């Protein structure tokens, strides 16, 4: 039988590499690629992976992100109708963790919450035992506390504080942080948002000596790094952004995961097309389980209860004289120091 | 006098077309600054592409501002689709029966999607208005990592905390899909697939002791693991018909654009199609209006994340034979 693999790529350079590395993955079964790039109205994509790939009669649907307005949705909804698990690459906001939206979704990405799991070690590696939080009134935000949270309850070294998204003016929060005696700062926003505090804190002079800013990719990205303040530590995944890696990774795990579900018994057919089969992939539940239950480009691939990734290194940034510099990087537990050495704002 | 709007009443296998047609046809809604002109569409395929190419098409064609979904499904997925559907063409949308009203919290920060159900908060209020009725103060509760479920057990330890009777909660125990535990009164929280393993032990069930789990494991009423005596919320799918459900979207739409154009003197431009886009602040006043419509009295507002505020709520025991026992309506329970 052929089994068809879609993908939702983002050029042909792209889909070049993951029919190349089907080819290079069929060493019972034929695998062949179907694959596309997103369609910039995602109505129509979502309309696209109805007509040219479940159409095909897809087991398993991939999915990159560009590097904005792009998301897995249209194709994570309308594959999720049946069970027909698709692996995002790329995208890391936690809306795609809940299980009860997001039917059939596993990521070879972790998500940005899980950077708390970093900051947590940074505490545990200075002795820092009183944080204040400042986070976006967004699922993402909330993510960040909530398991930066968890993993503190073993929340009183944790003093959160709140503000809407797109809050161009941020004096009344920062003002607050004054008043509670801050020193250890850790911020989880958007770019946008993040350039926001930024300015508003080298406004109050927040940013001296005294002061510790911890930080995730975010908001040691794009936009938010020029105004970022001088001596903040940020984050960074290792091989995050590389598509290819993600693609060639994805594809072999869901090689061997063909070759373990077709180990079992009793497997259908996936559907072929949208059009007519109102009901569910039955052995699509199942495919997924496999999925979620080796050594890859990227790293230790393997997923958590969510299917989202696991054992994910960061490089750990620090901000040295306007230039991104790395102090360290994040094992997957322990937390490992290189030769360069760390510069706190102010010095 | 009163401008007309086009709401879309889309039924998906959802007989009977004509019991829908004759019960709103009759409702005048002059007396109202506008008056709305329905248009059913009765389908059959119930997929992504044909509910999308549904929508999208009717919207093309006539000057559609509202669409109320109807379903015969348990399908989620449904839901979700529609809320998509919702915030990329910023027109409201409300899952009225079936999967599209399979509530579904966390949506789209854009949608304009809403659903004739209820939240987790609110039927865990009404399980311990139950306790508080027949005074089991002494109570457990069993969760799985299946989400909303730190929601429900916080929802139940907050009620409880802010107060001051006394309860006793005596163990909390977040499964995976294993320990014994003795409590009279519990309170089962997870999927119907894994509460039926759940339910497997010991059927700590069947001597003298309840059980008590809401709509996520009573599931689909009409269709071996379950306890005899078990009591559940459910939406009232009993007391509560199609035609009914479609009558009261239509006039949550209507009420809506009225109360907009009586007060800013203008009602929101139908989108032009799905295709295009290109030519915000329209589709969040009419979200302002739509989730807080007061029709006949009945206060018929939505929270903000797509829920009823006041739904019809029914206590239901556990032959068959889920059977209704209690509803509740605003605060209380009539059992």
């Known amino acids: 039988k052929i089994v068809n693999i879609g993908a939702v790529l983002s050029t042909k350079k792209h889909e070049q590499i993951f029919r190349e590395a089907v080819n290079q993955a069929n ?30 009669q897809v087991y398993a649907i991939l999915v990159s992100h560009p590097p904005d307005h792009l998301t897995p949705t249209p194709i994570s909804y309308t594959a999720g109708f049946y069970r027909i698990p698709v692996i995002g690459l790329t995208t890391r906001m936690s809306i795609y963790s809940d299980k009860s939206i997001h039917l059939s979704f596993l990521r070879t990405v972790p998500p940005y919450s899980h950077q708390a799991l970093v900051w947590f070690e940074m505490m545990r ?13 967004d699922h993402e935000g909330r993510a ?33 942080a004054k008043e509670l005696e801050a020193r250890v700062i850790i911020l989880s926003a958007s770019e946008d948002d993040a350039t926001a505090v930024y300015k508003s804190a080298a406004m109050l002079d927040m940013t001296g000596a005294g002061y510790v800013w911890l930080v995730g990719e975010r908001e040691i990205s794009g936009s938010a790094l020029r105004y970022a303040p001088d001596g903040i530590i940020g984050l960074q995944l290792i091989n995050g952004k590389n598509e290819s890696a993600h693609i060639s ?20 057919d996936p559907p072929r097309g949208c059009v007519g089969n109102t009901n569910i992939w039955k052995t699509g539940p199942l495919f997924k389980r496999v999925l979620m239950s080796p ?9 958590n209860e969510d299917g989202d990734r696991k054992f994910a290194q960061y490089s750990i940034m620090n901000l040295q004289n306007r230039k991104l510099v790395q102090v360290g990087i994040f094992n997957g537990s322990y937390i490992i120091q290189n030769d360069r050495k760390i510069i706190w704002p102010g010095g | 006098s009163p401008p007309s709007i086009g709401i879309a009443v889309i039924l998906v296998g959802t007989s009977d077309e004509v019991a829908i047609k004759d019960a709103h046809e009759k409702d005048d809604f002059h007396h109202l600054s506008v008056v709305p002109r329905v248009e059913l569409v009765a389908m059959n395929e119930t997929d992504p592409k044909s509910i999308i190419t549904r929508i999208c098409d009717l919207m093309s064609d006539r000057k559609i501002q509202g669409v109320v979904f109807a379903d ?3 399908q989620e997925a449904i839901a979700q689709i529609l809320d998509f559907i919702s915030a990329q063409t910023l027109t409201p949308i409300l899952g009225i029966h079936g999967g599209s ?61 802010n107060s001051f009777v006394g309860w006793e909660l005596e163990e909390v125990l977040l499964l995976d899909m294993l320990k014994k535990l003795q409590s009279p009164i519990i309170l089962l929280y997870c999927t119907k697939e894994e509460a039926t393993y759940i339910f497997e032990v010991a059927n700590l069930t069947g001597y003298g002791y309840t059980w008590i789990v809401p709509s996520l494991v009573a599931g689909d009423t009409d269709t071996s693991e379950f306890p005899t005596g078990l009591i559940s919320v459910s939406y009232d799918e009993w007391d509560y018909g199609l ?48 989730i807080n419509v007061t029709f006949e009295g009945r206060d018929l507002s939505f929270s903000e994340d797509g829920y009823q505020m006041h739904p019809k709520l029914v206590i239901i025991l556990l032959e068959r034979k889920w059977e209704r026992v209690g509803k509740w309506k605003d605060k209380s329970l009539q059992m």
């Open chain 1, 144 to 176: 960040a506390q909530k398991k930066l949270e968890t993993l503190l309850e073993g929340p009183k070294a944790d003093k959160v504080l709140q503000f809407e998204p797109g809050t161009k003016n941020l004096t009344a929060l920062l003002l607050e």
């Open chain 1, 249 to 268: 990774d994805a594809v072999a795990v869901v090689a061997q995961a063909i070759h373990e579900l077709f180990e079992m018994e009793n497997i259908t």
């Open chain 1, 125 to 137: 590696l200075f002795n820092w035992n009183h944080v204040i939080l400042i986070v976006s009134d």
């Open chain 2, 101 to 161: 009203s399979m509530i579904m919290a966390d949506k789209d920060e854009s949608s304009m999607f809403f659903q004739f159900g209820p939240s987790i908060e609110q039927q865990a209020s009404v399980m311990l208005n139950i306790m508080e009725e027949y005074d089991w103060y002494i109570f457990s509760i069993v969760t799985t990592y299946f989400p909303g479920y730190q929601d429900f057990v916080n929802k139940i330890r907050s009620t409880i905390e």
């Open chain 1, 27 to 56: 060493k019972k079964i034929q695998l062949q690629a179907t694959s596309v790039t997103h369609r910039p109205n995602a109505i129509q994509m979502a309309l696209s992976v109805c007509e040219d790939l479940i159409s095909s």
């Open chain 2, 243 to 290: 035609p009914a459900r479609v009558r009261d979207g239509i006039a949550i739409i209507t009420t809506a654009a009225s109360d907009m154009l009586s007060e800013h003197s203008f009602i929101p431009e139908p989108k032009s199609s799905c295709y295009n886009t290109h030519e915000i602040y329209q589709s969040n006043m009419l979200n302002r209006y739509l």
């Open chain 2, 72 to 74: 015969d499904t348990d």
């Open chain 1, 295 to 303: 050594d890859g480009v990227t790293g230790r691939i393997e997923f």
